[PDB]
Design an enzyme around this catalytic site. Sequence first.
Site, PDB file in Angstrom:
ATOM      1  N   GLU A  35       0.827  -1.202   0.000  1.00  0.00           N
ATOM      2  CA  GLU A  35       0.000   0.000   0.000  1.00  0.00           C
ATOM      3  C   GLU A  35       0.867   1.260   0.000  1.00  0.00           C
ATOM      4  OE1 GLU A  35      -3.215   0.322  -0.495  1.00  0.00           O
ATOM      5  OE2 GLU A  35      -3.810  -1.776  -0.492  1.00  0.00           O
ATOM      6  N   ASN A  46      -7.204   8.836  -5.856  1.00  0.00           N
ATOM      7  CA  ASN A  46      -7.879   7.875  -6.715  1.00  0.00           C
ATOM      8  C   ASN A  46      -8.727   8.569  -7.785  1.00  0.00           C
ATOM      9  OD1 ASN A  46      -6.831   5.568  -5.608  1.00  0.00           O
ATOM     10  ND2 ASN A  46      -8.662   5.011  -4.421  1.00  0.00           N
ATOM     11  N   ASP A  48     -11.829   8.440  -8.508  1.00  0.00           N
ATOM     12  CA  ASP A  48     -13.137   8.950  -8.128  1.00  0.00           C
ATOM     13  C   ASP A  48     -13.064  10.243  -7.336  1.00  0.00           C
ATOM     14  OD1 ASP A  48     -12.336   8.186  -5.596  1.00  0.00           O
ATOM     15  OD2 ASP A  48     -14.103   6.972  -5.185  1.00  0.00           O
ATOM     16  N   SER A  50     -11.297  10.468  -4.808  1.00  0.00           N
ATOM     17  CA  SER A  50     -10.970  10.190  -3.424  1.00  0.00           C
ATOM     18  C   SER A  50      -9.460  10.092  -3.307  1.00  0.00           C
ATOM     19  CB  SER A  50     -11.613   8.898  -2.940  1.00  0.00           C
ATOM     20  OG  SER A  50     -11.002   7.779  -3.537  1.00  0.00           O
ATOM     21  N   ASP A  52      -6.364   8.156  -0.675  1.00  0.00           N
ATOM     22  CA  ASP A  52      -5.935   7.129   0.268  1.00  0.00           C
ATOM     23  C   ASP A  52      -4.833   7.677   1.165  1.00  0.00           C
ATOM     24  OD1 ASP A  52      -7.586   5.088  -0.812  1.00  0.00           O
ATOM     25  OD2 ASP A  52      -5.955   4.330  -2.074  1.00  0.00           O
ATOM     26  N   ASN A  59      -9.237   5.259   2.913  1.00  0.00           N
ATOM     27  CA  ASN A  59      -9.845   6.040   1.839  1.00  0.00           C
ATOM     28  C   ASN A  59     -10.873   7.029   2.382  1.00  0.00           C
ATOM     29  OD1 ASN A  59     -12.290   6.102  -0.418  1.00  0.00           O
ATOM     30  ND2 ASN A  59     -10.226   6.198  -1.336  1.00  0.00           N
TER      31      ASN A  59
END
Length: 129
Positions: A35, A46, A48, A50, A52, A59
């Site tokens: 990760e 991300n 969308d 979003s 992390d 998220n």
Amino acid sequence: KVFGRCELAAAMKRHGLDNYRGYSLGNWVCAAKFESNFNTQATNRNTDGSTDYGILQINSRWWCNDGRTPGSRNLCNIPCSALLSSDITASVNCAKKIVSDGNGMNAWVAWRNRCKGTDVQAWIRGCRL
Ligand SMILES: [Cl-]
Ligand code: NA
């Protein structure tokens, strides 16, 4: 911060993540390598909108509040920034809600794509047990 490798297992082993929901410690530790490359300050967008956050790349949609993710639920009641701390408590605590959510560790795409099915003990091998 950045963590060494045993160095995280013990924290992760302190904070109650060994066999948390049957996931042994190699699974967490393995999740944390891929990760974030072991880095509490890690942040990646991300598609969308979003983002992390942190060691386990948690998220902003579902789990934390970053103020730029229009529909966020802040299911850990928390500011996404607090999860970049060099103190993994908020991350590990939120991680324990996520994993308990339905799909287990498959919530972490690098766990699925890279840890799952592999001998996750190589990740705790050399740690003082
Ligand atoms: Cl499971
Ligand atoms: Na949110």
